[PDB]
Amino acid sequence: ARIIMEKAVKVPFKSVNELADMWIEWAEMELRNKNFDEAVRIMAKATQAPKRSTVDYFDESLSPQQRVHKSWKLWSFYVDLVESTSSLEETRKIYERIFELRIATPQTVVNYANLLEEHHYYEESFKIYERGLDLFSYPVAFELWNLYLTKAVDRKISIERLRDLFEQAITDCPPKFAKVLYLMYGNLEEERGLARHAMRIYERATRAVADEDRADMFNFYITKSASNFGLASTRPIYERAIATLPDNEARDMCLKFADMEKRLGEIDRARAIYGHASQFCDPRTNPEFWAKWEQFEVQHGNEDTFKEMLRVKRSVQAKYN
Amino acid sequence: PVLQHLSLRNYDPVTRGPKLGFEAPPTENLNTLTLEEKAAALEAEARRKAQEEQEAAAQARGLDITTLQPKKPNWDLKREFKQRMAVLDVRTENAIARMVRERLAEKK
């Protein structure tokens, strides 16, 4: 059987996966024959190449035996065999050999981090997370960056190192992940530091988020400012939301600011905000805004104010026609 | 015997191949809340707090004093000073107790 397996390994088959399956079957037969060390030796001999092997496995010019070092299935089988048979040093050597061939996916980096965490090693898990982040920056490690952030939160690292890691993870991240990253950074700044850093992170997120989540981020920042500080601190930022949000979003922000000013007592500021919203929205297309302005004028506003509101509505109707 | 010395973390024992995160992502194996799990309940809590504040403002007729300034000024600085005065307060209390004991010994 060993001679037949060696002859099949020496047969240049078309598919390298066929040779990998034959090697895995030989290793399984050796393991069933109480030769797990011999199986690991045969697996290492099958995945034997130089320190800088760069032969593409998809290239249909070399033999499948030569293009067998970049086999992910054979490497995974060898790692699984050596995980329950050797110590952590051989597992680290196998991980380094897999990283040398650049055939390790984000799942491989996650498995290496889990193996490091299972061996009472947290700095090595952070090193593996950094390797996963550096090997694939933008798309393929945002989830790995989230896992690294979770590990750092569970490790209770120092504030400077955590801030540096959060800045590195949110440096060139896409906005769909950068919104959650900035929210987590603000939560960490509020939990383990002053609220000024969280406010600055929220302000940066309000200027660096997607247009769909810009209004939600602005509302969350306003709620956080009202919870952690005074409600007047959101007075200018909402004014900034007047200059940044989209037309319906700016109308909603102006309505919220007018409600806040009416609650505080700024009747003139609320009337000016309502007039700006009426100037920034058609009367026939935004009847809810006109109804809210009329309700506010009934709650606060005279007959002259009602006539001015009617004139503004007529002007908006003329502009929309 | 073959499926007894394997970690079964990245190799599928049924498909005889590498595990894929499209159907079995590793984030479901975490014992804590990830970044996808986080930043979602906080937004819901903020929305619920805003709705409760709006309902309280609609129900009430006068402006609450602890609604525009729910926290005192420099509250973060006060919290930082309280956190930094962890062993300093204990040292001051020990010094006060030592002074009281010295005064009692001088009286006695």
Binding site: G230, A232, L264, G265, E266, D268, R269, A272, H276, Q279, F280 | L63, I65, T66, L68, Q69
Partner: peptide, 29 residues
Amino acid sequence: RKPLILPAPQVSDSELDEIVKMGMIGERA
């Protein structure tokens, strides 16, 4: 959007500050 020059409010940030000082003084009383 054309820039709307909003007028200065009749109550300022400092005036609102002393207003909420008096408000929390009444509340704590």
